[PDB]
Every structure is written in structure tokens, then in C-alpha cells.
Amino acid sequence: VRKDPITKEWTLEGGALVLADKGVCLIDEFDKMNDQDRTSIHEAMEQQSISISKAGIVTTLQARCSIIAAANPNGGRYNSTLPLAQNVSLTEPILSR
Amino acid sequence: IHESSKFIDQQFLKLQEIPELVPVGEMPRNLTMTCDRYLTNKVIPGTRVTIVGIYSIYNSAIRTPYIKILGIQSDVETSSIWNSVTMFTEEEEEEFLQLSRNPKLYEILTNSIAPSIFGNEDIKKAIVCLLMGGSKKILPDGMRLRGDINVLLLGDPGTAKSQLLKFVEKVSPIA
Amino acid sequence: APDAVFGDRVRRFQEFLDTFTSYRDSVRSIQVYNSNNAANYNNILPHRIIISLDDLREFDRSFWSGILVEPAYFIPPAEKALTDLADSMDDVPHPWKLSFKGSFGAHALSPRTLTAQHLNKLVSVEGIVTKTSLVRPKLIRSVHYAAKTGRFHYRDYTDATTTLTTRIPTPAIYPTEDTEGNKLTTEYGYSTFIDHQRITVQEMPEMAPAGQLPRSIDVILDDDLVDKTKPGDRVNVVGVFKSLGAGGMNQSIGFKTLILGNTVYPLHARSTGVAARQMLTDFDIRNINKLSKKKDIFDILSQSLAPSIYGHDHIKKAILLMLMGGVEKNLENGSHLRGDINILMVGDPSTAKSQLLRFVLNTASLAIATTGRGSSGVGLTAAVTTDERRLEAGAMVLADRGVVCIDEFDKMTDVDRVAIHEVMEQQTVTIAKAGIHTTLNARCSVIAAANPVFGQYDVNRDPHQNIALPDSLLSRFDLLFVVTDDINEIRDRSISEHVLRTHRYLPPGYLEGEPVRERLNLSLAVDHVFEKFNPLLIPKLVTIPFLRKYVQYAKERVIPQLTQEAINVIVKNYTDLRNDDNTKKSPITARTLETLIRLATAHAKVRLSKTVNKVDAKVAANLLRFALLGEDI
Amino acid sequence: SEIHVRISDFPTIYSLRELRESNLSSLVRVTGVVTRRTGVFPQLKYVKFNCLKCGSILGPFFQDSNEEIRISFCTNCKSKGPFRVNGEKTVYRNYQ
Amino acid sequence: PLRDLDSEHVSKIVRLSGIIISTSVLSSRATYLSIMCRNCRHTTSITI
Amino acid sequence: RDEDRVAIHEAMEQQTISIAKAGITTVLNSRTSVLAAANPIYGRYDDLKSPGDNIDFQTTILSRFDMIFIVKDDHNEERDISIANHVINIHTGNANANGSEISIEKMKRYITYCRLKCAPRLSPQAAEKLSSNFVTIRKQLLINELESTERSSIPITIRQLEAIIRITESLAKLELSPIAQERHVDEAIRLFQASTMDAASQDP
Ligand SMILES: Nc1ncnc2c1ncn2[C@@H]1O[C@H](COP(=O)(O)OP(=O)(O)O)[C@@H](O)[C@H]1O
Ligand SMILES: Nc1ncnc2c1ncn2[C@@H]1O[C@H](COP(=O)(O)OP(=O)(O)O)[C@@H](O)[C@H]1O
């Protein structure tokens, strides 16, 4: 919920997940996500509905999107002898979906 | 003369297009709206509504569009502590009375909780007990005793724990 | 321009005042008190009186409904009648103002429900004070002096707020010259100024809907009503919901709406800044003294705190003493000695540490509840706003002369405890930050709860590794208790029957299956002695509001002093505590000597004794020994 | 009400840098990329004023996009109070 | 659709949907008010 | 997060959230029952390690909860085929689908009716049974705690007695009986054994 300084009013902008309600969301540099971005990704992939509770707006936007993501193995190269867990910093609940 | 005048109240609402149904890199278009009398205090921010009103024009060559409110078709929204019926019609009450006397209603509610989910029978029974909740009590000295039952699920992934939680929120009054 | 309706309302209210002689007696008492105060010089109570609207409704329904619905035409007649009554009574050679208490029906609202339909109606709003303007004087009469003639000229000013009915607008022009052109010198000190303050009341957080923006109303206070509230208080302001200004109807979006203030009530609530004062009737005082004459009065009171909590008798005695508190010493040179008892509870999960804290929160005159990580060192002590650079009083400052109940003390950050050091010991909060050098005063007693470091208190290791707290911090706490959840069949059984008896408790008038409804219990700040149901089933248990009355009476009336027999007992106990090694749960400092003195003083307070005897010192020593050694006789 | 006219294939193509001044009051063809849209605002086309002494809406007046006709002298009343635009009587056009 | 609002819809009842993102504070307006001349002391009652 | 955990501690048991930020001091109300699902400390919990190690939560958090359901994804071929067939039938197989299932809306309204109309109380003869079972359970856990050097990762405290009482009252409220029944107590103890004390038994 951000306010444009020139026009000075609140706008409810959903994430890329919300914008791609009935489409795809291409997430490049998937390993290099912020904590908030990771939490939002997890919420969208699990419940298909991002919820917002800021500035008095208490609602759950809908985001039913197929995610096509590109991520880089740890160290800029995939180590074959390790499993998928050690190769990518994403935790198992993120990958399982 | 203020002590003799009579007043009515006005409340300004601002409507925005549904955030998903917007051009990709464009700020959603919002439109200033006005209501009065008994239509005030009928919505809260974040609610998804349908509006019947008069499209109008306000001068700040260009003009500012806005809508007078004639009726607010408030859709079904999040059920909060305040947002609840709390009032049961008679026929509903007798139907619940009939249901309470069924001998297998414990099994029915066990079967009714996550029927698509296979197994986890005692888990479903505990979920039913959680949904009912215990008794909330207040001792004379001010001591308050817990009147809620909190349940933990702990197991390997893929055991439908997330799906069971989703069902619990879908069935419970507030969650 | 005399009016018939005004005169008739005036005489009707005079009849009402004559009917209910209590208001007449109160006016007489105010007058004689002011006269006596003037007599001693060869405080001044304000010319205000509280009216019970219920009695007015009983006496005259029409006039009552007139006050509630259209106060503009009804309050001024009542004030004139009251002024006439006061003048008539004051035969001994500034009008009186009127105030209201009682039920307001559908006009008792919150700032969220002050719809325009309630305008021009006597409303009673309840909420939290967010902003308070500075108490500024208002010019109402300006006395001037003409140097040539030598005659003092005056003018009287007014504005829409200071009167209920709309008066004809006369512009306020300051008289600079005489009618004949002579220069005038304004005479400050003869002109009259009235204090004026505006406060904003916001919807109460306890009752406000969660996740939505709050709604606020502005209150205009005047004269004696100024500075009766502190920001963050919970108040019940009653007054006319007047609307002011042309409201843009006149060519340059609504009307300026505010609640003109008639009466403000600081509402006591759980964990707020306002204390709770209980009225002490002579019946109550007699009962308190009679119960004080009992022998095991300390035991009776201590067992009365948490009947629903089995055991922890010594913790209950310590909490009772903490509520009573010790005397404060301010030496002539300027030094300060702490007179409060701090209590720390370290124990295994489910040993009732929190429930005791919650009881203290609900029963202390002024208590504030905080948790560890949620409330930082900014939450405690005080903080600078930087908005210019005003001080925001934190938890410990708000709880002055009160109790701070900290939960999850173990979890709270080390920086937070570094902050809390000085407050717990020196009872001051110093800012000296960002060019703001002030020393806030926070004389509060702290009670806290912490889990042992290893989740449970494993007695195999030393107390230091389980406690996991700095030694200085443990030195701050007067009494440190370690409670262990140990398995014992007799104790487990007894706990089981006690808890079961508590669960099968019926309210006086509730059905067997009826759900019990909670209430906010917003007590107003200003039946028998004992309790019918004792969950532990003979030592009598006193009723908890009576316990609050007893604590208030003891704290106010009695100030004990140390005596030689005690001095000797405390000295010997401190010496043999310090010089003997028994692997104490806490180290011994001079703070333990201060603790012995403070507990002795608190026990003397409990007995309502002006002096401390040997028995009080013995009790204090035994309690401290149970705290440290973990053992008693 | 009115038919507008579309003109395409202007032989002169000018980028935003070379407009200068000689191209003023002349038809010009430019290329670019859209950055921001200000939305739709109904612009006055057939404006209908009224006078306080009149008590009725004056005859509709066309308003071209140069500058609206702020009438100060009433045609009928010669009164200095004709500043009022009644909404539904005026015809509006989209402006973005 | 909120983007489809057109000048042809001015002063016409329009059906549309969206999301409420802000509700301003209640402002009291005038529906019947009594006025007075400062000179004539002539009471009146305007209705809006 | 830890700052959330410290607040969740008080919310679950004292049913309230205490706030003392700079300038605002209040005790909000959170009278809710929390249902929590979490993976163990590892991706898969190995009983090969000390079974107290696969329990990541501390003793106090588990003391808040009224039960800990340790669910294991066993490797039965017949049970796995059962789950697969169930899923296929549900997922547009249309092999499913009267009088044995209550609709979500109807069940929710029944929940509201049960919570708002009645709130039972324990029968006096139920108290003796509850006390006996509580003492026996604590003594069995003491036997285990003497047997095992490590303290039980899942503790049994007075909160467990509160949990059993609350479950019994929940069942009675479900049956809309103003007085809790002995059968209710037996069912509650059966759930308690099936939910807790098997996680405790699974651990040393
Ligand atoms: N016992 C089960 N019965 C039916 N479906 C199940 C069962 N276990 C898992 N599933 C299916 O697997 C998913 C649920 O597992 P999930 O919620 O991801 O578990 P976790 O809580 O460990 O993340 C859903 O697609 C659900 O249909
Ligand atoms: N000695 C006791 N007597 C009565 N109730 C007790 C006792 N010990 C624990 N309880 C109950 O157990 C629960 C846990 O108490 P609580 O204060 O939350 O524990 P903790 O010490 O972990 O903060 C409460 O419902 C309380 O009533």
C-alpha cells in the first residue's frame, strides 16, 4: 500500500503473483529473493491467495498462478554428488509445491 | 443557529479496480466516491463491493469524475468477530436441535471433517473437539481459565497437514 | 430581556435541587470549605457539582428529556438556578457550573458511533486520550486604564464555545483608546483569563475493531476541567456535541464538530496509567481495623490472593508484601533509598508463574503488564519522539507508584535488561539524549517471570547455569523464587482435586450449561468481608475488592518506623546470611539488608502498626531464608 | 453528435528532439513509446451556463479546447453572477 | 468496468464493481438549518 | 520468528496479548485456539537419533499445546494404494457421493450454535476419574523419566489436565448436554492417549 507523492493517495498494488491471477509469473533469480519475497512466494504457492493487512485494508487478494522460476545452484555450479537440498538455498517446503 | 439546525452525515469512499484485473505495469485506476445518511459506515476498506450510483462531475477545462452512492451491494467478505450473524432463525434452531440428538453425529462430524482426506481418524476427532472448544470460565478472584483447545500436528511432509488446516479454516466461523 | 420559559426552567430546577437535599449539602460544604481556607490565611474547590441524571429522570421526566435531547435550552437554566442557590446560601458578603453522572441511554457512545444525528445532544463518550493541547489562558475580560482621566475601563469578550446557545457575533476588538481618544494602558493582573485546553479522544483499543483505522473526536475543556487527564488515559468525557462554524456553507467539507466538555472521568482499566481508588466507608474502615486485630492476619490475607492457585504460599506472601510496599526515605542532603520490593519467579513450565502475575495485574491499584521481546527498552523507561523532540513515557514511567509485571523475562533482550537496571535500582529514568537532558521519575516495583535456561530447572547443575542472568540483575530483585514441578503422588492428587473444584464453579445466577460472558470492567477512578466460596476445602478468605480496600487503606494511612528490637534482629540475620555459605540461589549484598528492612516495613504495614516489632523482622528473615536457602523451619 | 476525422500517412516524420518552433500550428508526425496514461476525464463540449437573476440555464455554448468562455457579462441580465455550470445539461467528451 | 467509464455515462445510474481501499471520516452536513439576520433579527429556515 | 513466539506464548495460554509500546499501553484480547502444523527439526525425523532430538520445539511450547500428533508416513503398499485410489476418486473420478455428511455451511452454523448456546460443566463423578487418570499418567511419566536419563521431550503438566477437562467439555458441548458425562471423559482420555503419551512414548 504505497502513496504516490505527486498525487498523494493510497493505491493497493498486488505483487507479480496477484497480477498474474490467471496466467504465469516468471521469477528470475529465484535463489536471490528477499525474506518478504520468499514468504509471499510460499503463501501464493500454498494457498493461492495473498492476504494484506496494512493501512486498514484487511482482505485476501486472489492469486492462482503457475510459477516458472529460474534459480542458480549454490556456488554458481551444480554439484552432482550433493542432493537437491544442498545445491539450492531454497528450503524443502518451497520446492515441494 | 446551531442549536436549532438538523444535520446528516457524509462519508467519502475511494474505489479501486480489482488489483489483478489491471494493465501489467500501470497503477490501478481509483475513483473517489461519496455516500450519505444510512449508507455511511456500511463498508470497511478491503471489501469487494458492487456499486449502484450516479456517475458525476466535480470541478477541482478538465473535470474530476466521482460517483454519488445510491446503493452498496456488499459481497460476502471476511468473517470477523463483529462480522457475524449471531442470530439464528427458528427453523435453523430446530434443525440443529434435531441434529444434536443423532447418536452418530460424532461420527458424522468425524466423517464431515476432511472427507476427501483418507485416514487420520483421531486427528479428525481432535479437530472436531477443537472446533467445539471447551468451557470458558472466570473465577471470582479474577482468575480466568482456558476455554480453548489448541492442537499441534507434527509429522513428515505430505501427511495432508496443510490441507487439513485449510479445511479447518474453511469450516470454522473465524479463522 | 427576561424570558418566561427560562424563568420557569430555572424555578423547576430550583424545586428539583430543593427536593434532593444532597446537592444542597454539597454546595454548603464547598462554600464553608472555601471560607475556612480563606480564614486560615486571615486549596480552592471549584464551583461545580455532580448531578445524578437518574434522580432528575425520576423527579421530572420532561426536564430530564430536555437536558438529554436539547441541553442548550436546559443547562443554562439549571446553572442559573444553582448559582442562585449558592448566592442565597452564601449569606457572607463567577457563576457556578453544572456536571452530570448517571445513565445516558442511547447517547452513551464511542468516537466511532458519534454520527451527526447525535449533534446538539448531551453525549457521554468513552475512549483514549491521544493528544492534549497546552493549557492556555483565554482572555474574557480586559481591564484598561486611562492615564489622563484616571478611570479603569473594561470590556467582556465571548466566543461560540464558551456559551451553549448561539450568540450574536460581536467581533473582538481590543480597546486601544478611550471613548474620548485618551490612550489606554492594558492592566494585566486585573483582567480575567480562563484556562483553555483541547484534548482528542480516540476509540478505545480494547473495544476498537482490529485492523481498521481509528476514529477520534475533539473535546474542548475549560476552567477547572483543564489538565485533568494525561495522554494515553482512558476517559469518559460527557458534554454537548456541539457543531461550530459556518461549515463552508458561507462561501469560502462539513461542519466543525466537537464535544464541549462538561465533565471528564479518568476511567481505570487493566494495564493503563490511571490508578483505581476505592471509596473507604466508615463501615469498611471499621471492618479493616477489626480484621487487622486478628492474629494470623498476614496468613489470612496472603491465602486470599490466588485461591484458585494451589500452593506457592510463600510466593503469595511475597506478592502481598510487594503490593503493600515499604516506606521511602529521602534524606535531607538529597539522597534516595528504594522502598519497593521486587520479585522474580524462575521456574518450570506450568508452575502458575503467569497466572500469579495476571492476578497482580488485575488486583494492584496501578499495574502495567509487559512481555519480554515484544516490549523493548524503548517500551520500558522512555523514548524521544523526534517530531519538537517530546518525551514519550514508557512502561516504567507510567507505572510510577505502581507495579510492572514483566512476562518471559528470560527471553527479553540483554540491552533491555541493561536499560532496566537503573530503573529497578535508582528509580529514575535519565534521557540525556539528542539534546534532551531530563531525569524522569519512575518509582515502581517490578515482578517478573522466567523459565529456567534448560527449559526446566535441572537441579544437577548449579543455580548460575540454570538462571542464566547477570549477577547485578539478580541483586536488584529483592526476593528470588525458584519453583520446580516435581512428581509426587500426594501433591499431584491434591492439585487435581483443587483444579477440578475450580473448574466446576458456578456463578451466582448462571444456568448449569449457560456460557459465561466476559465484561471489560472499566472501573471509575475516584458484599461481606469474606468470600462465600473457598476452592481449598477454618481460615477465612477475604473478598478480593475488600483486599484492594485493605491495601489502599494500609498504603495511605500507616507509615511504620524501625525500632531497636527489629534493628537487632535484622542485623543478626544479615550478618549470618552473609558470613555463612550454604550455596544460596542468589548472592548476598547490602541489597539483602535493604530487602530485610523493606519486608519488615511492609509486614508492619500489613498489621497497621506505626512501628516495626520483633515479629515483623522474624517474618521477613524467615521469608528471605525460604527465598534464598530454599528451606524453612 | 459530431464526426471527427482521422488523417494517416503524413510524409514528414519528426522525432521529439527536432520539433524546435517552426513546426508550431502545423500537423506533425512523431514516434515514441508511451510512458504514462492520465486516464479518462469528461471534457466540456456543449457548455450551458446560467445567471442567478435568470433562474434558468442559458443557451448552450460551444467550448473549444483553447480556453473556456468564462462569461462575466450576462447576455440577458447584464449581471455579474453567471458563473455556474450545470452538470447533466452540458455535453462532455473524453479527454486523456 | 471501472476503466470503461465514459463521458456518455455522466449523470446516469451506473453499475460497477471494485474494491474499497479507504473510508474517510464521517463529515456532518446540513439538511435543515435556522439562520438569523445580525441586523433584522429575522429568523429563517433553509432546507437542503 | 522469536519476537512472534514470545507473544504467541501468552496468547495460547493467558488468552491475551500485552502491548506496552512507547506511549500506548493496553492488553488486547486474543481468545482463540491455535491449530499448528510443522515438520520436525529435520526434513524427515529419524528415530535412529535420540527421539528427543527430532522434536525441535522446546518444553514450554509443547506444554501450551493440548496434544501433539506425531504422524508417520508408513510404507504399506495396500495403504498407499488406498490413498492413491481415494485421491483418484476425489480428483474428478466421481466415485464419491446421504445423511452421513454435514455440509460446510451447515456445520459452521452448527458450530456457532454449539459455542453460543451451551457450555457444559463437569459431573462430580467425572472429577474422580480425571484425577485418577492424571495421577497415573504423571506416575508413568515419572517411571519413564527415571528409566531414561533424558527428561521427556513431551511434558505432562497441569496444562495436560486442563486439556483433558477442556476436551471432555468440548464433547459434552457437541452433544449439547449441560452436564459432562462419564462416556465423554472416557472418549477424551482415549483421544489423549492416542494423541499425547504416544509421542511421549515414542521419545525415550
Ligand atoms: N492421507 C491423505 N489423504 C488424501 N490426500 C492426501 C493425504 N496425504 C496427502 N494428501 C495429498 O497431498 C497433499 C497434502 O499434503 P501437504 O498438505 O503438502 O502436506 P504437508 O502438511 O506435510 O505439507 C494434497 O494434495 C492432498 O490431496
Ligand atoms: N499450583 C497450581 N494451582 C492451580 N492451577 C495451577 C497450578 N499450577 C498450574 N496451574 C494451572 O496451569 C496453567 C498454567 O499456568 P501458567 O501460569 O500459564 O504457567 P507458566 O508458569 O508456564 O506461566 C493455568 O491454567 C493454571 O491455572
Ligand code: BEF
Ligand atoms: F510454560 Be510457562 F508459561 F513458564
Ligand SMILES: [Mg+2]
Ligand atoms: Mg505443508
Ligand SMILES: [Mg+2]
Ligand atoms: Mg508463563
Ligand SMILES: [Zn+2]
Ligand atoms: Zn442573467
